[PDB]
Design a binder for this molecule. Structure first.
Ligand SMILES: C[C@]12CCC(=O)C=C1CC[C@@H]1[C@@H]2[C@@H](O)C[C@@]2(C)[C@H]1CC[C@]2(O)C(=O)CO
Ligand SMILES: C[C@]12CCC(=O)C=C1CC[C@@H]1[C@@H]2[C@@H](O)C[C@@]2(C)[C@H]1CC[C@]2(O)C(=O)CO
Ligand SMILES: C[C@]12CCC(=O)C=C1CC[C@@H]1[C@@H]2[C@@H](O)C[C@@]2(C)[C@H]1CC[C@]2(O)C(=O)CO
Ligand SMILES: C[C@]12CCC(=O)C=C1CC[C@@H]1[C@@H]2[C@@H](O)C[C@@]2(C)[C@H]1CC[C@]2(O)C(=O)CO
Lengths: 122, 125, 122, 120
């Protein structure tokens, strides 16, 4: 029922910036995890837990301080802002969501996935 | 030399969302604080959120009153600072001004900031 | 080269007032059109032509006498003062600029655009 | 929305070769023009249709330059052979969803900063 669709990716030079988006539709309920994963040439990049009351955000150590996850709730859109891009950031960036997760960064805890948007860092 | 220009302000219903932007130009140097302050008529400026950027990577700071509702981010290639607001409350109403400085002992001390934009108004009804 | 930054929209009741602003930066040149368009999921609302020596102002018939366009050349800012707002004024209002245009309201001739500010009149 | 970044330029002797690259990212849509300009003269462009492409060259570079694009890598190439001194310039890539004349720079909505080519 929950549908996720990513956009905004592409090819960028090392050191560059990029902002990815993912739109959500369907009966999500009010609380859960909304996350970005990357499949490089499937690791958790960043995630936000929305409590439905506030919010908690998590980052992978390799992107801390370079990436920012945010969301516009009125627009049902999740964002991944990327700065200081490195070649090892290359991959298919997929958004995922779930009502319940133990590890925010474990892909198998997520029940809804988008197809992804490719990011290739020169 | 450093110039800051905010945009994206507007009117919103309580519970709504809004994203502010600020573009910088000029000789900033590579390191320092980039912050959002808010001020209502007759009130003192209150630090909302800030980032500290090092020579490389950034750290982020939030006022307790906006934590978990506002998110600060920047796009360095676009020289732009963002404030994503969600779950807006009437008490978030104010003139939102972006500020920057190479040097600040504490992120929320407006007296330490050296460049200021004119601001963009956010009204929450 | 040219960047357009908008502000000032949002929610208001019918009969209300809103004041849109757009700040321009970059290499614009000295003459041309500076316009407001409204986009629903782009029709011209108002524009100014600056000949760089005085200006001329243009309005869509449906906003004449309710909206006023003005510009501060010192602050490089364009304003749209919207009084007596009606529900049909609802839309995404985007600023646009161009050196040449066959008609002020022909958005296809405008190459520089702002992201938009949403205006919702209940 | 659309971010274009060129690379591959520099200083080269007449008669030499160079391959410029431009990477694109962001929400582009599926159809439009992707072009190389030198400064502002149209050098070469490719139109990609919804189906699948059409390519155009300035008369002064026909038979010497080739434009191509790797759609999987979101990269536009300008292969320059038999370079001449009048090819010197700042080569900028541009893109747009629609244009009447592929070579008219004023019709393009997105621009890169460019890569300099100096032919001695
Ligand atoms: C993570 C979440 C719940 C768990 C899930 O499987 C899918 C998602 C992604 C979208 C999130 C959603 C909930 O948190 C409520 C949210 C924030 C929504 C976007 C807008 C929203 O509907 C609200 O803001 C409700 O007020
Ligand atoms: C806080 C800072 C330094 C202190 C100052 O007075 C003004 C600013 C705001 C813009 C920041 C800048 C530096 O950090 C370098 C930054 C990040 C820049 C935006 C893009 C940038 O120029 C770079 O990314 C260069 O690497
Ligand atoms: C429409 C125009 C030229 C065409 C274009 O693509 C972008 C714009 C909007 C900003 C205008 C500009 C020119 O007219 C010169 C202006 C008025 C400028 C704001 C202040 C200005 O720079 C001056 O007043 C210079 O005297
Ligand atoms: C010219 C175009 C559309 C108009 C625009 O402002 C930016 C460009 C450059 C990149 C092109 C794009 C579209 O044509 C779809 C393309 C080909 C894309 C490269 C890979 C692509 O996304 C696809 O291959 C879709 O199948």
């Amino acid at each position: 029922q929950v549908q996720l669709q990513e956009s905004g990716g592409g090819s960028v030079q090392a050191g560059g910036s990029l902002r990815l988006s993912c739109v959500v539709s369907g009966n999500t309920g009010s609380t859960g995890y909304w996350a970005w994963f990357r499949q490089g040439p499937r690791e958790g990049v960043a995630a936000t837990y929305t409590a439905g009351s506030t919010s908690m955000t998590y980052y992978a150590d390799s992107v801390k301080g370079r990436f920012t996850i945010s969301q516009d709730n009125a627009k049902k859109t999740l964002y991944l802002q990327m700065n200081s891009l490195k070649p090892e950031d290359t991959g298919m960036y997929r958004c995922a969501s779930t009502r319940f997760a133990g590890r925010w960064y474990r892909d198998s805890e997520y029940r809804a996935w988008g197809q992804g948007t490719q990011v290739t860092v020169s």
